[PDB]
């Protein structure tokens, strides 16, 4: 899986 | 944004 | 901050 | 679409 | 709650 | 499993 | 804060 | 439990 | 104590 | 597997 | 790395 | 502050 900060 | 993967 | 899974 | 605010 | 399933 | 912000 | 996984 | 600083 | 196991 | 804070 | 900055 | 995972 694949975590962001926007 | 930037993205870490887990 | 918002940290979000794709 | 599922985020945590940090 | 702020939380995300990992 | 999931990372909760407190 | 704190970020704690359960 | 299994928590750190943020 | 900076880490955590996911 | 590990996520550390720094 | 694997790092973001938040 | 960073979050890196190992």
Known sequence: ?6 | HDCVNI
């Open chain 1, 1 to 6: 899986e694949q975590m962001c900060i926007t």
